[PDB]
Symmetry: D2
Subunit: 454 residues, 4 copies
Amino acid sequence: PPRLRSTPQDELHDLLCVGFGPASLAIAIALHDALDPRLNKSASNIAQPKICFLERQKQFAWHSGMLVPGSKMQISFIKDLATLRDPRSSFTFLNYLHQKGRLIHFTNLSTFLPARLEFEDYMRWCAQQFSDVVAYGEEVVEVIPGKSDPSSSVVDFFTVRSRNVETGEISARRTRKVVIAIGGTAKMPSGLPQDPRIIHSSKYCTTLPALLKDKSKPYNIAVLGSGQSAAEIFHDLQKRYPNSRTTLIMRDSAMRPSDDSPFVNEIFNPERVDKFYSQSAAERQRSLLADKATNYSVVRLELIEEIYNDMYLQRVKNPDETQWQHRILPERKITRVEHHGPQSRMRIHLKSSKPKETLEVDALMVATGYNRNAHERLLSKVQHLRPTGQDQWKPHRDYRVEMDPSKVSSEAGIWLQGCNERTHGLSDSLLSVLAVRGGEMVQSIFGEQLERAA
Amino acid sequence: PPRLRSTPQDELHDLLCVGFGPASLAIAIALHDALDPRLNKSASNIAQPKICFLERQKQFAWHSGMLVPGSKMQISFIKDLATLRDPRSSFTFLNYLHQKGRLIHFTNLSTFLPARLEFEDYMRWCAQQFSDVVAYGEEVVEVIPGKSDPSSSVVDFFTVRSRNVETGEISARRTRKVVIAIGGTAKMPSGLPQDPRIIHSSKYCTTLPALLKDKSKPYNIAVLGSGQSAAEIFHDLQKRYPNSRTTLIMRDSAMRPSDDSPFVNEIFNPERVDKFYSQSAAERQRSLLADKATNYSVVRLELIEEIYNDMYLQRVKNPDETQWQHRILPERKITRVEHHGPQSRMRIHLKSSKPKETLEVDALMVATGYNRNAHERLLSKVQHLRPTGQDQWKPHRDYRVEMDPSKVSSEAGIWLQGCNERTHGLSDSLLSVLAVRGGEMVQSIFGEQLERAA
Amino acid sequence: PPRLRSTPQDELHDLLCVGFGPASLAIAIALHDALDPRLNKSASNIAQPKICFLERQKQFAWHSGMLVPGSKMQISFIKDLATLRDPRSSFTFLNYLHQKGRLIHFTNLSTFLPARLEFEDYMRWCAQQFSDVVAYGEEVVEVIPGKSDPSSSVVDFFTVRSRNVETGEISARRTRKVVIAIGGTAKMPSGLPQDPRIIHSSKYCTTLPALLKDKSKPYNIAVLGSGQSAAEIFHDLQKRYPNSRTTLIMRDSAMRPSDDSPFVNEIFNPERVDKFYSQSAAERQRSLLADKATNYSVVRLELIEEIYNDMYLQRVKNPDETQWQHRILPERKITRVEHHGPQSRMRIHLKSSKPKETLEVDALMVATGYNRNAHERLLSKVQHLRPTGQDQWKPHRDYRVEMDPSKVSSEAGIWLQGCNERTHGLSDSLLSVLAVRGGEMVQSIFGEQLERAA
Amino acid sequence: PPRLRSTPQDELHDLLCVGFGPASLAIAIALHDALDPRLNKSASNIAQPKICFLERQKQFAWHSGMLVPGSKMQISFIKDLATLRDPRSSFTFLNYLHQKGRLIHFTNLSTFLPARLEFEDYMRWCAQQFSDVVAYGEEVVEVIPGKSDPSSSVVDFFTVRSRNVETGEISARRTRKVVIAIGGTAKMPSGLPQDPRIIHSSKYCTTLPALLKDKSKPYNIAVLGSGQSAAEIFHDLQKRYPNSRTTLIMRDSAMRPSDDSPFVNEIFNPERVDKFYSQSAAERQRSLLADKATNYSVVRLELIEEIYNDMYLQRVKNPDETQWQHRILPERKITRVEHHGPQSRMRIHLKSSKPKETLEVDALMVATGYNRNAHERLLSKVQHLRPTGQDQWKPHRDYRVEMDPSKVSSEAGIWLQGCNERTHGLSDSLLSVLAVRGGEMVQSIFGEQLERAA
Ligand SMILES: Cc1cc2nc3c(=O)[nH]c(=O)nc-3n(C[C@H](O)[C@H](O)[C@H](O)COP(=O)(O)OP(=O)(O)OC[C@H]3O[C@@H](n4cnc5c(N)ncnc54)[C@H](O)[C@@H]3O)c2cc1C
Ligand SMILES: Cc1cc2nc3c(=O)[nH]c(=O)nc-3n(C[C@H](O)[C@H](O)[C@H](O)COP(=O)(O)OP(=O)(O)OC[C@H]3O[C@@H](n4cnc5c(N)ncnc54)[C@H](O)[C@@H]3O)c2cc1C
Ligand SMILES: Cc1cc2nc3c(=O)[nH]c(=O)nc-3n(C[C@H](O)[C@H](O)[C@H](O)COP(=O)(O)OP(=O)(O)OC[C@H]3O[C@@H](n4cnc5c(N)ncnc54)[C@H](O)[C@@H]3O)c2cc1C
Ligand SMILES: Cc1cc2nc3c(=O)[nH]c(=O)nc-3n(C[C@H](O)[C@H](O)[C@H](O)COP(=O)(O)OP(=O)(O)OC[C@H]3O[C@@H](n4cnc5c(N)ncnc54)[C@H](O)[C@@H]3O)c2cc1C
Ligand SMILES: N[C@@H](CCCC[NH3+])C(=O)O
Ligand SMILES: N[C@@H](CCCC[NH3+])C(=O)O
């Protein structure tokens, strides 16, 4: 039973991981498993690797701003952080349930889709077992190249600088290898102005109740978007604020269901990463477009049906749609936001989305998705180590970015996780392949040491 | 297009119906249909029958105390008040939806089970078309035999006395024929005492909010029973009073699902009334017991699953069941109720139901079903017209009760509706056969007149 | 109760309909209903219109080549040929079931989706009531303009010439107004050669058993396509020929589910035809593309799941996919068909569909859809009556094609049905709006006469 | 990684298990797991126990006579032979799928209910890992008491005699402890005569095709019963013999659905065995009756719906039920079977089951369940070791039968498995608690040795 011990800050690490979300957690789990002589017989002959995870949050949390009450996983629990790699792992969802005394009780639900609350707790339970090698409240701000021989022209380590979120102090740690697994940042439409009453979906549960404190007051609340987050928020607002008037604004004509049909869904199989990666740029782009309805701007059928039913019940009570407490406004775009008025309410102007009315609202929830380019800011000072004229980070199949072999030692490298959809497929940003990917990553990074034991 | 005109109070009626609930409404609809030359070609040759319906409520309503938000019909909309007799009828659910401008919208729900709110409105829409022949706010208090020749020993009419619910005045109407369609009365366990805080399920929506006025207060509310009403209330309380502590008390070990499987469910077919009626007393009793799970002490599967899921989510948050906000207490019976205390809360003592704890609650909802014997109080003064030594009303196949042929003229009679489960089957008290039964009833009562036209 | 009587062949008709499929049948039903004084009170004052339907089949049939055993409707039974226009109509699906003694039995299925076999019989039952005004075994071959004054330059009638399918004789009928409701013709890929062993899906049930007579023989049968017809055939072959080796060839990567989600599905509402028609050419094209997954190249989820399950069971028995009895070959196109060999089997050559193997098969089923341009062949001799320079038939909102007002009298006209997707929407070729459309069509064609009664 | 080695026939065993079905297999798995130092840290200090399993079949098989094509498990795969005891076990269903290369593929089915074919293979894969300690083709015929000191009056071992199914030779093995896990024997109604054409459901797949060799011939085949086996066979016959005329005979009025609702289903939780066992004889009997619909004379809802649908399709084709190819004959009992006729068909006489027709059939399938009393025949010679006057085997909570402490040494004992419903609950004969029970059994039998290591 291996327990990963901490490395002193001042020592050269074998690996430093930026972020301790699901993607990094799955690597921590895979490494534990690779070192467990109960699962990997060769691990009897294997000194502990010097590893550290840096996480900006104060403790493990999973999209806490969107832990909407009643919200469910959109993925089978079998695709947890260990099972698809090894069902014998102690880090499986079912083993978690066993450890909690809930296994028989979950079984009686006959569901593959746990509440997001439950799956977060599963990952929290997993994450707590690595507390000795994780530094929370640490926001990585840059990765700097290092040379053990400064007079040479070869880079063989990296310095990772992080800011303490409480004290603001900068700490440095040196490592041979870096993983960047920082997820995404809130995507806001460029046309919207900054305002406390305009809030991205990622901050829904955490910041909206601070703005609208009275759950009984008749607030007007708009929601922009038509994907899963938009539908979840729109539906939740009606429960959370029973006397409110909610409006869903979308440029599309309707909410559309996610495609989870079994043949299409095979694009998410771990085996398929090889097939997707080995295609051309054009084929990968075309494939992404063809399968878009599996993940992007789509809503789970069950939720669409529930919302539609709520709308129909409003029709039963009142045939005049303009008098409905909760409304959906399709094929529309925001053209102007008035937010300097002495009123508590902003004034939102709407036009057709085809190439109209005015709304007075207390808050606008913006469910417009994420960008996954934040790693570029962290890596700006290592850009010069890329091969000449390359202005994009190119991840290999094993997620290690390409660098000039004559500038960077074979012992040093940087891996990207969760931002590689374009090269690795639609499963990249999701939970789908994390168990298997974690195992691949451990092989890629710690292969040499693991072979000496093997 | 026939429109039933009112009969003056002082005139001898052909028919007087006690109650204007679903059962009487289906008779009104069938009579309209029988007189509609568009549906019944013979009706061209057919004077209007002198008819009146007496209803104690101020206006049409359908189990208003149990119009729980979100509650659904447990029966296909095809089994409405007309369709199974004639799909061409203007009183079909689909024609109602067409008249309302909702037909296409309902179609898009892909559901056979409308909200109870919607189905009530359907029946209200139907009922409003008979407002000229219905006297609301009139509670029938007795049915008295009458003799057009008082010196004779033959009864040939009945006087129906009703009390105005507002003024308390007694009005009489004389009729040749009487229908009693008064549904059921609240069944309370004999062991429980009378108290404003102890309320039958039938009075849930109408009287509980008057008792517990603050929807935010942390009330303790118990629910007794394990049938559909108990589950509906238990589930609704958690929505209506978010900070409340609810407890479901049942003598059974678990909530059990209603059987709606297709072969068993055929007992509800209109054709099957003939088969059920023609069996012996023992066979009818045995059949009722064998099929009990179709109607009695059962909960719709979907609702059991929802409640169970809510319970599991409580387990996720807290593994200690005694700390759960909402609890179910199986295999238990109330033995004592303390309700004279200076406290606002009653003290409910519990023991095992096999041949324990104490609860402090602000209200006890009692979901213990209905009796259907209230017609006996109304008919006590006509009992002597039954054949000698008969101490039970015996309905024929056509629902007309047996009377001594030498005491009662062939032109006079009394019909029972909705209280005949023992002779007619499990569909008797339900909506299942009302369309067809209404048609049979019109034939039984108005056959002679309808034949002259035929 | 109106019964449409036949018009002698030699008389000038008010209307002549080409085709007696669902679209023409819905017009016949609407006309009956408009003339029924039981449904339309004004019809008491209304001489019978002189009408005739010409149908090339020997008797009413509905896609008989695709009456696959077990195949189901993809549309709610509420969207039958009358209900959405008038639920009181005797031509509703529910009234049909009542007339058949099956209403209670269908109700117990709890399904909105009847077997295609059942829905065909419903339409057959409807169609048989118009046998006096339908000429079967008559294939319309041309529509010719006529002038009651031949020296004038104004057209005021049309001659319809039809070929007797048995005798080959040409018959003519003259009418003021023509409806063309001829559905679609089999679409075959241009690259495939003509061969008795290459059969379009439309001829599956009728012609394939004549080719492959022994249901026990181990035939190799390929299926080309990935829409509903392809999946239905692929699945059925495995039942019909238990020892056969079936192959599904598709250029797409996977079978994709049809979108029947409630918000998107509203594009099929009758009310929406007005909204769709009133858009620009670009907006209509964009809208058609956006909603394509509702109808084109899609398979019902349930069927995809069944086929996938069958595939998984093959995996259980044998992990080597190349040995599977039934296989799916995605992302492939046929490049060559060898069919001159002394062998009973054709040789099908396959390549990637991205811009491989060889199959030896006894039959190739081609499920590649339909064209709806066959009306152009029938109307070639009336093209000159279109406004100058117009080389496309332009249907108005009411389906009447545009003609030069100075060449064609106001009393004469031609209507198109079922080929108008581009102007009227995705519901045009389907059953979705037929009841309502039939009513609109009767108003458009017989408005003048119906107003005199009104 | 422990591998159980064989014990020579002539050595005194620690344990001898009669039967190698699911129940014994779960004990073998639990013992392996208890000895696995990877799962049980104490097992590092633990000589191998001398164990042997005797199985009458030639190789592992699971109800092979009822491996009906398409038949599914009625239990969640989580309730496999290891998971509920330890999800880390290599004997879990998911680990089996991983070892087979099918884990991702099963995941994509979104089902908790594998095909019986698949679950048998899972158990076969498990069973093959114990081939060194299992003797197949050995039918145990008696258990005889033994005394290491024959002049003493204390029994301290047992001799198990088994017959080789091929050679007929009797072999003996001596053991301290015996487990009897022999499942059930076919229950036939006493009124039916012996005939090759009258076959119990347990022999359906294995022996019926030998009798009715021509799958195309129009055989008449009757099925008696109304539980899961009856429905499965009735449905399968229609597929297997497409031209046959099948009849389902039942004494009940209808097929009834199994209750798998979540609250009731908790009776199957492993924890609940303690609660059930600790009740009185009357309470246990009453509890068994109350929950009967979970297991006995019930059919999975989905299958009832399918069969009902098939019946409705027959109604569509022909409204005359007496002409239906496949029929159900409710509320009936067989009174006479004529089977001496020169005809190939037997003549079955039917009467009402309430306290009729004749059928001519080629075969009668009898789906009338199992008895679980066969252990009494094997134990007749050890009956005298029970406490005085005890004429029933009384299993303790830990499944060890009560014996006179002064006649039987503490080191010797006999355990019963799968025949203990009356004392242990409805989960006893099923797969529900096998993983946990296997663990309890290993503790009960090998506790002393396992503690020395602990
Ligand atoms: C509301 C919601 C629901 C979802 N549901 C599902 C689902 O059901 N199934 C599914 O497959 N996928 C789902 N997803 C997709 C989601 O991306 C993955 O579940 C998962 O979060 C990916 O993990 P990650 O580690 O790549 O990114 P994240 O989960 O975002 O984790 C990245 C971590 O890095 C930390 N970090 C960021 N920047 C820094 C820095 N500079 N220094 C230090 N630490 C930093 C962040 O605090 C965060 O903890 C969902 C996404 C959202 C938003
Ligand atoms: C909450 C609830 C939900 C149900 N849901 C369903 C369902 O989904 N499907 C189904 O098939 N069945 C259902 N039922 C069964 C129900 O009995 C029938 O739907 C229906 O109410 C039977 O109609 P009825 O006219 O016989 O009785 P009621 O509906 O009770 O109508 C009787 C009427 O008589 C009036 N009345 C009583 N006494 C007098 C008097 N002395 N003088 C004058 N008027 C009087 C009453 O005010 C009432 O209006 C439900 C029952 C309940 C309580
Ligand atoms: C297998 C299949 C299943 C389908 N299922 C559904 C469904 O579930 N729901 C749905 O909404 N839609 C469905 N459709 C769409 C289908 O187009 C409509 O159901 C319907 O057939 C449209 O009717 P129509 O009259 O426009 O065309 P058709 O049904 O093709 O009828 C046209 C008629 O015109 C006749 N005809 C053609 N040419 C001539 C001529 N020269 N002279 C005389 N007569 C002629 C033909 O014989 C035919 O009877 C399905 C289509 C197919 C192929
Ligand atoms: C068709 C069918 C389907 C079922 N499906 C399910 C399901 O989905 N879920 C569920 O929980 N339960 C199910 N059951 C219940 C079933 O009892 C259990 O799944 C399981 O078979 C119990 O295992 P067992 O070892 O107690 O008995 P068995 O499975 O009968 O095994 C007993 C073994 O002992 C052997 N044996 C018998 N006598 C002797 C002898 N004298 N000498 C040597 N060997 C002997 C037999 O050959 C057999 O291999 C099903 C039962 C049947 C019949
Ligand atoms: N299942 C019954 C109705 C039961 C109603 C229970 N409240 C039917 O089909 O008519
Ligand atoms: N429902 C039971 C299994 C019943 C099996 C019936 N053959 C369980 O969950 O364990």
